[PDB]
Structures are given as C-alpha cells and as structure tokens.
Design an enzyme around this catalytic site. Structure first.
Site, short mmCIF file in Angstrom:
data_model
loop_
_atom_site.label_atom_id
_atom_site.label_comp_id
_atom_site.label_asym_id
_atom_site.label_seq_id
_atom_site.Cartn_x
_atom_site.Cartn_y
_atom_site.Cartn_z
N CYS A 190 13.46 -39.68 1.62
CA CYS A 190 12.01 -39.65 1.75
C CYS A 190 11.51 -40.96 2.33
O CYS A 190 12.28 -41.89 2.60
CB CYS A 190 11.37 -39.37 0.39
SG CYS A 190 11.72 -40.66 -0.81
N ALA A 204 12.40 -43.86 0.11
CA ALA A 204 13.77 -44.31 0.31
C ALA A 204 13.88 -45.18 1.56
O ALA A 204 14.63 -46.16 1.58
CB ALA A 204 14.71 -43.11 0.41
N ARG A 256 22.19 -49.06 -2.84
CA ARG A 256 22.54 -49.52 -1.51
C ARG A 256 23.16 -50.91 -1.61
O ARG A 256 22.63 -51.78 -2.31
CB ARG A 256 21.31 -49.56 -0.60
CG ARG A 256 20.98 -48.25 0.08
CD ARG A 256 20.56 -48.47 1.53
NE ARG A 256 19.81 -49.70 1.69
CZ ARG A 256 19.60 -50.31 2.86
NH1 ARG A 256 20.08 -49.82 3.99
NH2 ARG A 256 18.89 -51.44 2.88
N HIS A 289 10.53 -46.14 7.21
CA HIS A 289 10.79 -47.35 7.97
C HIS A 289 9.53 -47.83 8.69
O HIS A 289 9.22 -49.03 8.67
CB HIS A 289 11.90 -47.12 8.99
CG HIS A 289 13.20 -46.66 8.39
ND1 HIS A 289 13.54 -46.89 7.08
CD2 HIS A 289 14.23 -45.99 8.94
CE1 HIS A 289 14.73 -46.38 6.84
NE2 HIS A 289 15.17 -45.82 7.95
S1 ICS Z 1 20.85 -47.90 10.29
FE1 ICS Z 1 20.09 -47.83 8.18
S2 ICS Z 1 20.60 -46.01 4.39
FE2 ICS Z 1 18.71 -47.14 10.36
S3 ICS Z 1 21.16 -49.00 6.64
FE3 ICS Z 1 21.51 -46.90 6.23
S4 ICS Z 1 22.65 -44.45 9.78
FE4 ICS Z 1 20.01 -44.73 6.17
S5 ICS Z 1 17.84 -44.27 6.56
MO1 ICS Z 1 22.49 -44.73 4.99
S6 ICS Z 1 17.83 -47.75 8.33
FE5 ICS Z 1 20.83 -45.71 9.64
C1 ICS Z 1 20.52 -45.93 7.70
FE6 ICS Z 1 18.61 -45.61 8.19
S7 ICS Z 1 23.58 -46.18 6.52
FE7 ICS Z 1 22.19 -44.83 7.65
S8 ICS Z 1 21.55 -43.10 6.40
S9 ICS Z 1 18.87 -44.86 10.33
S1 CLF Z 2 10.09 -37.72 -2.51
FE1 CLF Z 2 10.73 -39.91 -2.73
S2 CLF Z 2 12.22 -39.81 -4.43
FE2 CLF Z 2 10.95 -37.93 -4.63
S3 CLF Z 2 9.20 -38.37 -6.32
FE3 CLF Z 2 8.60 -38.63 -4.03
S4 CLF Z 2 8.82 -40.89 -3.60
FE4 CLF Z 2 10.18 -40.28 -5.34
FE5 CLF Z 2 10.64 -39.54 -8.10
S5 CLF Z 2 9.98 -39.45 -10.45
FE6 CLF Z 2 11.60 -37.84 -10.07
S6 CLF Z 2 12.64 -38.58 -8.17
FE7 CLF Z 2 10.89 -37.21 -7.48
S7 CLF Z 2 10.44 -35.97 -9.34
FE8 CLF Z 2 9.04 -37.72 -8.79
#
Ligand code: ICS
Ligand code: CLF
Ligand code: ICS
Ligand code: CLF
Ligand SMILES: [Fe+3]
Ligand SMILES: [Fe+3]
Lengths: 373, 522, 522, 477
Positions: free
Chosen positions: A11, A14, A45, A142
């Site tokens: 999301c 994230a 991460r 992002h």
């Molecule tokens: S590089 Fe980044 S955490 Fe942009 S560190 Fe991560 S292969 Fe994610 S959201 Mo894993 S900034 Fe790529 C990413 Fe996105 S490893 Fe991949 S999916 S598009």
């Molecule tokens: S799309 Fe992203 S991860 Fe989802 S809620 Fe929304 S910001 Fe968060 Fe959060 S406490 Fe649990 S995990 Fe959700 S049901 Fe809500």
C-alpha cells in the site's frame, strides 16, 4: 489490482513508511492509526543503519498511536499531540518526527498537518505529516513520501551557507541500504575521490537530507521511487542527477566510469585506480562461481551480475517465494536478499555469487521425488 | 574487499577497517550525531526507575506493541477450513502484510485475497469491489468457501458485509448456494485473537443458525474442539492425538495444521485438509464444545451456548500439569471415555522430568508476554515448576483476565513477587526488565531487541530471551513445536531448563576465572 | 558472606572480593604456580600446528577418549529385555561406574548387579562369586532372566562363564530352566558398542541355537529389528512408530525404552517393557533381520545370517533423507507392505524444512564425533544439507568403516574438505579445531571443554558445541530426542539451523557495533 | 518407632535373602543406641560385599584416583589400563580447583593408557614409559605424574614401580605409582589407604631436608577436604579470618607443592577422617604434627570447630575466632529464621560414603530436621563409634546397604527427605520422596561453613517443599 486475485503489492503506507521514511534513523516515525500496520512492518525491511536503537536511532522500533474505537469516532488529533509530547519526553535525542497516516486517518477527517505545524512550532522540531493512507502499489506511497521530504525537510537549509562544499560533493539518493548495499556502494565512490555528503534513506539522517541540496551531483539508485525529488532538486537547486548501477562487476565499472566522467581528470584517474584494485577480486569470484553457474536460466537492474556469472535471464527456469519453492524451482528473495547481502559493489558481487551457487546447486532441490514414487 | 575463499556477508564485512573508517567519516561529517557521551547518558537514563515512571505514565504513545489487528486472526481462522480462501474486504496492503507475517512465522505459502478497495471505494461503498472480488476469487482459486473479513478502511466507511454478499449473490456474481461466511473484524477493536473469535463465530453462524430445528445435542457422540488463534502446529496435533488415544469422537473446528505444513514434493497445494463444511453443519449435534483458549473465544462461547445449546465447560487452556489434567478429566466426563493408561504414563513422565529438573528451575525469575490464554497457561506452568513469574505482560488482555491471573498467582507462594500488566507494550517491559531484572524473558522474536538493550547495559544485566509464542521470525521451524498438553509441557520444561543451563555454561566458560563451576554433570 | 534473600552458589559466590583475595593468597604463598605469562605462552603453543603434529605423533598416551568399555554396552543391551537383570561378573567398582554413567545420561534408575570379585577371586577365580551372586540376585530382585557380562578382571583371569553358570545350575544355586545368557565383554577389546554386540549375540544364541530344528524363515510375517547401542529413546520410538504406520509386523529385540522412561507416579518399577523371551525364541521365524547400526553389530550379523539363515540387508543406519528412504524401501520389499502416504508426507515435510533452512546451513563447517554408525549417519545427513564436514572423528572406528565414510564423502561435493580420523581422541580433536577451525562441533558433553579452550584463545576462535550423541550430562532430557528417520532428521536440522542462528544473534548483539545485522527476520 | 519396631522391620527385610546372605546382612543393620561407645557390639562394617545384591560401593581405584589423587590439580593422573575406568570417573566428582586446564591444571581431563589386547598379553610397562615421555612432551607444565592402576595392572604382572622410578630419575620428575587396582579391598576405603601410603612414600618427604620455607606459629593444613562445590574454600576463608595460615589443602584445589609443604605446618585439621587419617597419623609420628578432627557442616558444628581449633593456639587466635563467630552470627541466624520454619520436624535418612552420614547431622538439626536413618558405603568401626553418639535413639543404622534393603527401609520409615548418591536419586524420586544428592551436592554448594550453610538450607527447602512432590498421583487415580 484486480479484486480478489491474491496480489503481493503493498500500500501507500508501505511505500512511504516502509520504504522511504522508516529507514531515516535519527527520526521517529509514528504509524498513525490502528496497531496492525506498524506491527507488520516493524523491522521487516533490512535497511541497515548504525546507531543506538531507542536512544539516538529508532528504525527497528514500532511507534504507533494504537487507535481504538474512541479515536475512530471522535478523531485522533488530540491523541497525536499528546503522543508527540510523550515522544519528546521519552526519546529526547530524536532529531524529528514523521507521522505516517494509516487508512483510517484520511477517512475520519483527521487533520495531522495542523497538529504537526502546531507541535513543531511549539517544540522547535521538524514534524512531517505524511498522508500515505494505504487505500490511496507503493509507487504512490513513494510519491507522497517524496513530496513530504520536499515540503518539510529538503529546503530547511536553503538560507544556510555555512556548509563547506567541494566540487566532488555527491548525494546517494534512494539507496535503502538493504543488507548494507548503500555502504558497499559508498566505499567505492569515496575510493573514487568523491565525497558522499548525503545518503538516504538507508542509514540516512535528517541532516543528510537537509544537506542534499548542497551537493554537486545526485546519484539515484531506485529511480522509480525518488525521481520526483531528484527532478525537483534539479529544477530548484540546479543539481544534475544520474542513475547508477553497482550490481555486478560490469555494471559497477560502467557506472563508476560514467560518474567519474562528470568530474575532472583526478576523479577519472582515481576511478581507474579503484577498478584496477578490484579487478582481481571479482575476477577470482567469477573464476570460482561461473563454472558452477554457467548456462543456468533465471526469470531491469539485475541482468548485469547474472550475465557476469554466465547465467541467462529470461521454459523450465533454473531460478526465479514459497509458492515457487513448492514447485521446486530454486528461489531467491530480491527484496531482503534472503537475509543475506550486500549484493551491490564488488564485495556485494562476491556475496551474490556465493548465494546464487548455494541456492541453485543445493541438494534439497534434487530430493522432491520420493524414490518409491 | 573480499577473499574468494572466505567470503564475508554484511557481518563481519562491515567490521573491516576500511568500512569502519568510511562509517566514521560519514557520521562525523554529515550525520550531525549526538556525542557518544550524551548517547551513553541517555541510555543509562532509559534504564532507570525514573524513566520507568515516565514510561508507564504514557497514555497516547504505544511503543513496540505485543499484538496485531483483528483481520490477521480472521485470516488464520479461515485458513483452518477445507478449501477455504480467506478474503479481506478492504485495502490490499493489509493482505500483503498478513501474508508476509504468516509466511515469515510458518515459512509456508499463505493464501489470502483482497478486493483492493481504493480512493474510489472511500467515498462510495466497496460493494462493486465485493462483487468483482468474490467472482474473481471463485473463478481463479476455485475454493469451496470464501470467508470474508474486513480491513480498517471498510469498517470505518461502514461497509455492510451481509448486504454486499447478498447483492453479489442476487446479481449472479457468485452462486446463491456458494458459502460466503463473513465477520466484521475492526482493527481498532481488540486484537488479532478478537478477529479469530469474530471469524469463527461468523462461520459457525453461517453454517448452523438457520438449521437448528433438526439438531439434537449429543446425537453424533462427538466433542467439538475450538482451538482459537494458534500458531504451533504441534498444538493441533497434540489435541487430536490425545483425543484419539482416549477413543473420543471429536471435531476440530478451524484445523489449519495441514495447509500450513504441506510437503515439498514438487507441486504447490493451495488447499490442504481443514474442517469440512459437513463438520461445521453437524457441530450442533456434538455432546459439547470445548474452547481451548476461552479468554479470546467469548463471542464464540456466547453463540455456542445460546444457539447450539451446548454446556461449554469452564476449562482453562490445557497447558501444564493441572490444567491438562482438568481438560482430560472434563473430556472423560463428557464423552464417557476413561483416561487411558498411555496418557497416565505420559503424565507420569512429565512429572518425572519436573522432579529431575526442579533444582535448576526453582526460584528462576521470568518476564513473559503473549496472548491472554497462552500467557496464563505459561504462568500456571511456571508456578507448577517452582519458578517465579515477576513481569506478566499481556498487551491485549483485559481486567477480568488480569483478575483471573492474579487469582492464579495468589494460589501459589511462587506468585508473590509477580505483577500482571495489561495494555502495556514491550517498551514498558524493557523498563521492567531493567529496573526489576528477571533471569529470563519468555516471548516472541521482538523480545530479542530487549535482550540487546540489556546486554548494552552490561553482561551481568543481560536478560536472555526464550522464544515461545508468536511471531517467531529469527529461528527456524519452532512453529512445529507443542505448548499444550503433557507433550507441550515437556517441550516447554526442556526448553526452560536447558536455557538456564546454557546461560550457566556461558557464565562459567571463563578459563581460570569462572570455569571452576563449568561442571560436566548438571 | 551471604545475603539471605540473594544466596549465591559457588558461582558467583567465589567471585566475591574476600574469596578472590583468599585464592590469590593461596596461589602466591603455597601453590608455586607457573607465572601467568608462561601459562599463556604454553596455551598459545597448544593451539599451534606444531603442537598438532606432536599431538598426532602420540602412540602410548590417550587423552580425553571418546569411547567407553564393553560391559557398559552389554548392560545397555541387557536392559532391553523383559524383567532382565544385567549382571557383570567381576569387580563391583565397574558396576558402580556403569550405573552412575547411565544415571547421569538418562536421569533414570539403572539396575545392574555385580558378584563383587575381590583379591581372593584374583587367584582362585570367581566361581563361588558366580554361584552366590546368581542365587542372591534371583532371590532378591526376582528377575525373569539374568544376562551376564564381564569386567576386565574376570576376562584377564580367564573365568569360564559358561562353566561357572552350568555349575551354578548343577549345584542348585539357580533353577536349571532359569535363563542365564552370557557374553565375554573384555574392556581391552573394542568399545562399549562391541559389548552391546557381544551381549546381544549371547542372548540370541542362548534362546535360539539349540532349537533351530522347528524354525522356518518367514513363518511369523515379522521383521526383527536390532537397534544396537542406542541412548535416544526417540530412536526406539520412531522405529516402532514408522513400522506401525506401514503395517509391518516387527520384533524390536533389546528394547529398553520403557525401562529407561518409567513414570514418576509414586512407585519404583525396577523392570518395565523390554523384549520378551518368547520374542527371542520366535525370532528365527521372522522374514528377515534388520540391523540398525551394522558397523557394531558384526558378530550379531554373523550369528543371524549363519544360524537363523536370514538374508540381512546391506543397509546403512536410517539417518537422514537418503538412508531413511533406503530403510523404508527395504522394509517395504521384505514385508510386502507399501510405504504409506503418511511416511511420504513426513519425508516431504523434511525436504520442505531442508529447503527452508538451506541458506543458513549451506557451507557450514562441522567437526563431529561419536560412535561409527551415528557418525556416518550424521556425515551423510550433513552432506545432504550442503554442510561441510571437516573433522570426522570416531575413536572406536576401524579401517573398513573409515573406507566406507571416505567413499560417502567422495560421493558428495561437500566432502572434499573432510578428513576421517579413527583411533584419535578429543585432545586430537582440540588440536584440529584450533588449527583448522570449523563453525561448530557436534558431539557429546565432553566437547564443552574444547569449546572452553577455544574461547580462551578468543571469541573469534570459539567453536560452539552442539550436543548430539552420548553421553550428554550438562543438559536435561536430551535423551528423549530422536536422531533416526525423518523425525530424527527434522530434529537434527532444527537443532543445527537454530544453533547457527543463536550464534549469529550472539555475534550481532553488540549495540552500535554489530547490531546492524541483528535482524528480526532470519 | 521403638527399638523393637525397627528390629522387627530389619528382620522382615532380611527374609527374602538366601541363608548365607541373610546371616551376613544381619550384622550390618542396627538400631542405634547413643550410649554405645564400641560399635562393634552393635554393627559390623568394612567387610566383603555380598555378591549379586546391588551394592552401592565403588572400588579402590575410585577411592585413590577418584577421591585422593584426582583433585591434585597440577599433577597428571594416568588411569593405567583399559579406557573404561578413566572415562566413567572423568569430571564426575566436583572437586573444584583454580587453574588453566590442559596447561597447568589437569583435573577434568582423562589421561589413560587405553589398554588393548596386546597390552594385556605382553604387558604395558614399555607402553607406560612411552606414555610418560609423551605426557612430558605435550604437557610440559605438569608438576608431577601419578599412575593409578586399574584392575588388569595387578593381574598381568606389570611393574609400574620400576617404570616410575626409572622415568622419574631420568626426567627429574615425581612419578607416583599407585597400586589401586579395583579388585583390591572391598570398597573405596582401601583405595584411600593405598593413596595415602603412596602420598607418604613418593611426595610427602620431598622437602624433609629443606628448611627454606618460612614457618609461622599459625600454620595449619586442611586435610581431607576435597573442595566439593568449593567446600574447602568456604572453610579456608574462615580459618584465615581466624588468623591462621592454611599452608596446604588436601586435596581439593590441591597442588603438589602444598602437599610437600604440609610437614612444615603446626596443625593438621582433618575433615574427612576416613580417607586421610592414615597420612595424619603418619605425620604425627614422623614430624610430630598434631591433628584434630573438625566439622564445618552447619553453624553449630562450625562454631564448635572454630573454637576447638582456636583453643590450640594463643589468645590472639581465640579473639579473632570470637570476632569471626560474631561477624557471621547474623547471616546464619537469618538463614535459620527464613528456612527452619519450612523444615522444622522433617525427617531425613542418609546413605553416603565414609564421613558425611554423621558429619551433616548437625546442619539438619540446625534446620530443625531429624535424621532417623543413616548408613555408610565403606566406613570402618571407628566411624560407627563416632556416629552412634550423633544419631538419635532407636534410629536405623545401615552399613553397605543393598538397593533392596534401602528401598524397603524407606518404604517402611517413610522419610520426608533422602540424602544419597546418584544411583539412588531417581529410584527415590519415582517413589515421590524428595531426594538430595549428598555426594555432589546436586551440582550446588558449597555446604561447608556459614556461606555453605546458607546454600544448604536453600537447597533443602527447595527440594523438600517443591510443588512437584504433590503431583505424582493423577487426579483420576
Ligand atoms: S527499488 Fe525499492 S521494498 Fe523501488 S527497496 Fe524494495 S523492486 Fe519494494 S516498493 Mo521490495 S522502492 Fe523496488 C522496492 Fe520499491 S526490494 Fe522492491 S518490492 S520499486
Ligand atoms: S492498506 Fe496499508 S497496511 Fe492496510 S490498514 Fe491501510 S495503511 Fe495499513 Fe493496518 S491496522 Fe490492520 S493492517 Fe490494515 S486492517 Fe488496518
Ligand atoms: S573423601 Fe570419601 S562417597 Fe571423605 S570416598 Fe566419597 S568428597 Fe562421600 S561421604 Mo562421594 S569419605 Fe569425601 C566422600 Fe566422604 S567421593 Fe566424597 S561424597 S567426605
Ligand atoms: S573395579 Fe574399578 S572401575 Fe572396575 S575395571 Fe577395576 S579399577 Fe576399573 Fe574399568 S575398563 Fe571397564 S570400568 Fe571395569 S570393565 Fe575394566
Ligand atoms: Fe516450509
Ligand atoms: Fe528421570
């Protein structure tokens, strides 16, 4: 995403908290809302950093407002202000706060911008509201996080000229230091004679973000996630930016030469010296592992090292998590590097080759069929 | 630099001198880091009783919680039913997180879908998302059932799950007879265990509410078992094994042990085992229903008592000697099956191990945390072992549960120095283990950070972590362990006494300093 | 001094300043101790390659052996038979030691008697001791059988066990029909496993040699299982469980699992379970006989093949994936019973665990030691894991066993850095782990001292010990574990990967120094 | 129970025995009469064990290598013979020491000649000399070697004395041949005697002509304390607090040098009379050094022993003794106040080797506990003379008790606690009776002295009052 189809996409929260803001080590990032999001993303991460967790660094901790029913019904702005007060009391060495909005924040009419403004003016502290509500992939997350960086942190030292600049000033933008990747890159650039003034968000500090507009060149690794801020810095501060790829010896050498060409002859000579110094190491890595990996098949920034190890990127692949594992196809994590790494730079290439050999050639993949079946 | 014959990963590669110099230059030049003396002073302050008082005065800030949100428990409960796809009406990021969480704990594929509600569904409803998602999920993954829960966004905007599913059936997106039980699982209420309770009650209501006329209690001669939120496969397995050893007919409702433990034989199995729909339909015909974790199965208990008309026994979680005895005796009373000699012998062997290890267990001080039923079972067992729980933390506990645990503590002399904390997080626990240092903690992987903190104060202040609970991310295959019954008690006892002995060995490994006590025999 | 609320045992009581000063005064005044610099120099010398060459030049001196004497194995074998008293003809000190050894490993009562031969028997022999002892043992402890072995005293003086027992029966000291099998078990030949082999062959001969006329191979539709010297109860249990799941009729000969795991229920049971005399008498009627540990069951193999006429299969110990597969397929072929779906699923789950943990297991360097069959099974499993065995030590191994293990190592790319050592002790292994440092040791409790030594060289040189084998004295209830079959492979894999992960967590626990790699998720 | 009741119980227990065994065992079981001064008229000890009766006794090698010589830390003790004896006794006895193991201390190591068949047939004296050479090469900091004979050594005609003499003369090394073959004697007791004689013959007289050691009037040697769990250290701190100088410690944490310095002391404080009375008597005859028995088990015995010892010296030592008693009085009074209410009236029966069955009675009585039965593995008649006055009237005394005998005695008497060794612990834990290892202190301790008394009280309370003992009966049974 098509509804009901079991996607892996994250999301906006994230993308913003998990990817962009969370790795900033000396800030405290409040997962604003119910408890789930911050808990699932806590230390999930491997954005490596150096610090004293809980004292001057906070990356692996989970700060949350832990919204209850009353916070949903009557709003959580007062709770946010009180939480900021408690953060100041209990973590005095923090150098700023971000407020990462979870899904309910935008749906209940909460105005975290006003709370951030009032509390930041009251405590003389940078408090960055991020409207990264999860319902808004992580690409939009992002973008929102980059806009927050631009609006609340990046221009903090626009009128400050006390930082001593050099013509070799570069900023590493968008390297999240997965398993130390950014560090493995940084040692090369500083060996080239460049000064890495800013590095964020991996092992990143708020001061480094503030110093980024003072550099002579922006080196972007994850172009997709920080191209907004990079173009803004080009437009406003006149700072050129360029992509760099340190994954595998070929890409590393090409990227180092391209970066050095942006500077004078001394940097180019030092780049050639670094390349000559590291040539035997990655050549030995290739000599050891390419025979063990020649001809193997794998399903944009990754083709380099795979080809450097004699592998083909594309059916019956030899390599492509748990779903593919159940089919018996050897799998490697492209996100956490399977809790290994770094994979960038020459040292990262050595680690990458060892990991590829260990996973592809592991005997476990040869034991799927029972001898009586 | 790397030596090709001895390649270094991040540790210890970044301990190399050049990396150390690089990091020092970065910190000194651009991080504007606080002086190390100031950092040390602040850390020492965070280890003090004054900091603990400030920490426990928190009202708005939560730091390092020891709970998750309801839909996680809803998903876990849904996974326990045959050919059932968990379906979380709401935003997709939630499902990504749930799947990753369970993947990391179980090291197995975890099936779960979302209908990907976005800004469009924020103003309008998620009804179109429900119709399209139900149709797509049924067409793509061919489940026998779809169990619908909710993310916080759907709950906040007030999506009517029942009306949405009824509409999906009316406009033909999914068949009318296709089972789609649902439950509202608001993340801002309770915790993950509450989501498990709500989902189980929703499924049971869906399969039994409108067909109660022909149900006769005890007609199938079986005992229903509701495990609740459970992440040790050994616990499902031990319950089934003990009931089978007794020759007791039983129905495990929400049995996910097969789907979370599929073999690696070259094919991916999305579904495996689980409670069948016929079992849920026939559940009201059981002799009774036993709730293994009653302190988060209150809604389920209300439904089972008020609709199935089952006289659900007042039983604690079957953990440790006395409570396993009580569970087995109640099962014997309900079923009429006597407790067989095998279970008696297993109990005697557990008692034998207790007598063998009591000298090392006695008086050992533990902080511990987890879900309410698990925590109280652990406290009861520790009291049975002669150990003193000192810091009992249940972030998702309530006042009634705290009163019950305090009653348990007051019934033993080993509970005198014990305090129960509800609604407190692991930062509170970090303060507690600094100011009132126990010998060990018992908890999930997050406790490792606390251990790190204690070691930073000094080796003599380090509180080793013993990994029992959920989630366990930094060890492999501990989810296969057992914590229930005599077998679970034996495993827990072995883990505890051997953790004590490994710590003692580590403290006595110093040549010519402490190795006079480095005994071969313990 | 002691604080009544915080009483200290030896550690850390003797770390008190007054005790430290007292010990310093004692050393300085009267011990005439070598200076600490000399001690450090000599220790550093003992860690060197030159010291290793000197150490491996040993011919007469043995330091810290990794084996015991034959009568220990004879007693363990005898304990596996129903209501059987182990009876060691010879000196009583041996029996005291055997009993204490097994008491400390199993934490259980161990019944064994001696006829207490003394100086008079050293010249006149121990015939009177045998008569009196057999009569006293039968009268007092009322066994259904007395299984006789020897201490080195009786072997050296040449006591004729057969003649002594026959004379005891003739003179009426014991009834003629009372079973008294015997085996000469010289402690100066082989090791404890040799004593187990000799004892089992003696019992089998006693019950089958003179009654082979009416025996027909395969009459009883069963497979005899000879476990050999076995100190994991889980190994007996897993063999029986796996044979039961296949529906294979079996006879476990020398089954001590019950008598070594009696419950604590207020009553002491001197005897429990065990192979009945009827099973031994009917053993020649089995379809075949499978020896679980062939490399110390040579005499038993010769007797079974030559007298029972069973075609004993060439099977390795059922340890690890490939060898468990071979054992199960051979059992399927002999019995005609197919391998059931449960065992196939268990195999798939073991493969799944291997796949999940291969990244942490791959390339890890192990020194290891133990008995020949156990050692080779461990080596085979480590090769299946991608681990690199480096130092393979078997003090009681032979040249043919070494050739077999070298063949196994040459069959794998992960064995190219391995060396097999026979006749070498744990001081040799200490030198090996100093000069060619592995990541871990796998062995019995005696390895802890090696770990201590390695830590004294420095934390970077420490080789942690993983306790698999016999005896394990400094941990509790590890004897309940399993090393055989898919279950044993699962347990061993879990132990190995979690030992690796605990070591990594310890190395990365330093705040702001190495905790950048203190990952929550591994 | 009354004396007649205990006599009746003894008679019923003996009924199962064959006639010879019954007649023999009748003389080793007694009902205590505290007024008896000659225990021979009540009980017989130090006799041949009855064959096949599951005795608890060890062998002479255990008494010599395991007990006396083994703890000597800077010497290397070779278990001469097959591998078994050295392996089973390796690190089994918690005789604590301070040293660098494998470099200058060797207590927990197992050095053996690992006899094979050829060694049995052709002898091992050449092998012994080669082994000594290898020991000198690989452990250059060892200050001496002992050669503890296992059973085969004395049966194959080996002459370890000649090898020891030749190699010691060549290497300028003290090499002590010990003829402690396991078949010798009837128990560990003759092992003690043989080890004491070996100490006398090969070590004790080394510095007879040496006068360089500066002696003080307060020179004492602790004799017969083997530092189980640090016991001797807990004793030593008291004696030095009293103003005495403990020159030597026999043999727990002992070095060969302090053994050689022992003839220079003013007083030999003997704790274990059974194992070291021989060498104490020899030192009295040869050097004129007085020796006295003492007891540091529990505050009452410790205070009595401290005062009796201080009485042998001048007024300053007596004053320091009173200061020590006053200093430690609040600590052990606090221990008693905490633990006696939890242990008052509890009944214990003991079965230990040679000294502790009578020596620990005072500590139990200090905790309000009553010793209703006691017995010895290998004590002599002088030990029973000493213990008859210590035990209560009509209590049960047993010598070389059989496993059957002890089980039946416990079943009838039903004690609240049993103190014995590892071979009885799990037997009595099965029967639901709390058990404390009184050889190894259950890997706890020390129990000597005031600090030891604190540990002892804590351990007795933790085992006797453990919850586990209330759970051996299933509620459905
Ligand atoms: S590089 Fe980044 S955490 Fe942009 S560190 Fe991560 S292969 Fe994610 S959201 Mo894993 S900034 Fe790529 C990413 Fe996105 S490893 Fe991949 S999916 S598009
Ligand atoms: S799309 Fe992203 S991860 Fe989802 S809620 Fe929304 S910001 Fe968060 Fe959060 S406490 Fe649990 S995990 Fe959700 S049901 Fe809500
Ligand atoms: S030496 Fe003796 S059997 Fe006096 S052989 Fe034995 S360490 Fe016992 S009752 Mo084990 S005469 Fe010492 C003894 Fe007592 S080994 Fe220890 S506890 S006080
Ligand atoms: S009474 Fe004593 S312990 Fe017994 S042998 Fe004799 S000295 Fe020794 Fe040794 S190797 Fe094994 S344990 Fe014996 S049978 Fe020989
Ligand atoms: Fe898995
Ligand atoms: Fe036991």
């Amino acid at each position: 995403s098509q509804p009901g189809l079991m996607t892996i996409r994250g999301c906006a929260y994230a993308g913003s908290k998990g990817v962009v803001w969370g790795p900033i080590k000396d800030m405290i990032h409040i997962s604003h809302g119910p408890v789930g999001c911050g808990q699932y993303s806590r230390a999930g991460r491997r954005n490596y950093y150096i610090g004293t967790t809980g004292v001057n660094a906070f990356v692996t901790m989970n700060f949350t407002s832990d919204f209850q029913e009353k916070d949903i019904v009557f709003g959580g702005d007062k709770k946010l202000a009180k939480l900021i007060d408690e953060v100041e009391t209990l973590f005095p060495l923090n150098k700023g706060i971000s407020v990462q909005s979870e899904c309910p924040i935008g749906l209940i009419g909460d105005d975290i911008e006003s709370v951030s403004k009032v509390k930041g003016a009251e405590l003389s502290k940078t408090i960055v509201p991020v409207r990264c509500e999860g319902f808004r992939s992580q690409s939009l997350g992002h973008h929102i996080a980059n806009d927050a960086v631009r609006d609340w942190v990046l221009g903090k030292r626009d009128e400050d000229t006390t930082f001593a600049s050099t013509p070799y000033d570069v900023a590493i933008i968008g390297d999240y230091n997965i398993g130390g990747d950014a560090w493995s890159s940084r040692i090369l650039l500083e060996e080239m004679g460049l000064r890495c003034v800013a590095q964020w968000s991996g092992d990143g500090s708020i001061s480094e973000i503030e110093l980024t507009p003072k550099v002579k060149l922006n080196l972007v690794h994850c172009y997709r996630s920080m191209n907004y801020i990079s173009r803004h810095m080009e437009e406003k501060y006149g700072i050129p930016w360029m992509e760099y790829n340190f994954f595998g010896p070929t890409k590393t050498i090409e990227s180092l030469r391209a970066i050095a060409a942006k500077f004078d002859e001394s940097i180019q000579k030092k780049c050639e010296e670094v390349i000559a110094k590291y040539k035997p190491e990655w050549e030995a890595v290739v000599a050891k592992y390419r025979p063990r990996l020649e001809g193997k098949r794998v399903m944009r920034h990754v083709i380099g090292a795979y080809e450097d190890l004699g592998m083909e990127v594309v059916i019956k692949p030899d390599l492509i998590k748990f779903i593919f594992q159940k089919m018996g196809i050897p799998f490697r994590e492209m996100h956490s590097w399977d809790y290994s790494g770094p994979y960038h730079g020459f040292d990262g290439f050595a680690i990458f080759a060892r990991d590829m050999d260990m996973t592809l050639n592991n005997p476990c993949w040869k034991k799927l069929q029972a001898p009586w079946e | 630099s790397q030596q090709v014959d001895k390649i270094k990963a991040s540790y210890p590669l970044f301990l190399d001198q050049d990396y150390k110099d690089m990091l020092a230059k970065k910190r000194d030049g651009f991080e504007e880091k606080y002086p190390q003396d100031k950092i040390d002073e602040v850390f020492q302050w965070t280890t003090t009783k004054e900091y603990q008082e400030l920490n426990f005065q928190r009202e708005a800030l939560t730091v390092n919680p020891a709970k998750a949100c309801q839909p996680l428990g809803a998903v876990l409960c849904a996974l326990g039913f045959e050919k059932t796809m968990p379906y979380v009406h709401g935003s997709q990021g939630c499902v990504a997180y749930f799947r990753s969480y369970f993947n990391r704990h179980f090291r197995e594929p975890v099936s779960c879908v979302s209908d990907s509600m976005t800004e469009d569904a924020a103003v309008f409803g998620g009804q179109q998302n429900m119709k399209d998602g139900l149709q797509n999920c049924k067409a793509t993954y061919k489940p026998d059932m779809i169990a619908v829960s909710t993310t916080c966004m759907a709950e906040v905007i007030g999506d009517d799950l029942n009306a949405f599913i009824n509409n999906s059936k009316k406009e033909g997106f999914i068949p009318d007879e296709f089972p789609v039980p649902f439950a509202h699982t608001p993340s801002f209420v309770g915790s993950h265990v509450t989501g498990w309770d709500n989902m189980f009650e929703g499924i049971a209501r869906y399969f039994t509410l409108k067909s109660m006329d022909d149900k006769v209690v005890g007609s199938n001669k079986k005992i229903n078992i509701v495990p609740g939120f459970e992440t040790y496969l050994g616990n499902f397995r031990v319950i089934k094994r003990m009931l089978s050893e007794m020759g007791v007919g039983y129905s495990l409702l929400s049995d996910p042990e097969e789907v979370l433990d599929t073999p690696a034989d070259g094919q991916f199995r999305m579904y495996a085992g689980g409670t069948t729909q016929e079992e849920m339909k026939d559940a009201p015909n059981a002799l009774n229903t036993v709730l293994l974790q009653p302190w988060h199965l209150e809604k389920t208990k209300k439904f089972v008592e008020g609709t199935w008309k089952h006289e659900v026994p007042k039983l604690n979680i079957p953990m440790g000697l006395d409570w396993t005895d009580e569970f087995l005796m109640k099962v014997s009373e309900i079923s009429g099956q006597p407790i067989p000699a095998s279970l008696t012998k297993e109990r005697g062997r557990l008692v034998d191990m207790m007598t063998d290890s009591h000298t090392w267990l006695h008086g050992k001080r533990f902080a511990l945390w987890g879900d309410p039923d698990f925590v109280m079972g652990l406290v009861k067992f520790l009291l049975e072992l002669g150990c003193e729980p000192v810091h009992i933390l249940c972030h998702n506990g309530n006042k009634r549960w705290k009163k019950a645990v305090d009653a348990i503590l007051a019934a033993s002399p080993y509970g005198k120095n014990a305090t129960v904390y509800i609604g407190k997080d692991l930062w509170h626990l970090r303060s507690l283990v600094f100011t009132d240092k126990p010998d060990f903690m018992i908890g999930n992987s997050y406790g490792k950070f606390i251990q790190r903190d204690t070691l930073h104060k000094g080796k003599e202040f380090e509180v080793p972590l013993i990994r029992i609970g959920f989630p366990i991310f930094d060890r492999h295959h501990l989810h296969r362990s057992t914590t229930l019954g005599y077998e679970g008690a034996m495993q827990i006892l072995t883990t505890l006494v051997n953790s004590i002995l490994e710590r003692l060995d580590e403290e006595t490994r110093g040549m010519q300093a402490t190795d006079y006590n480095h005994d071969l025999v313990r």
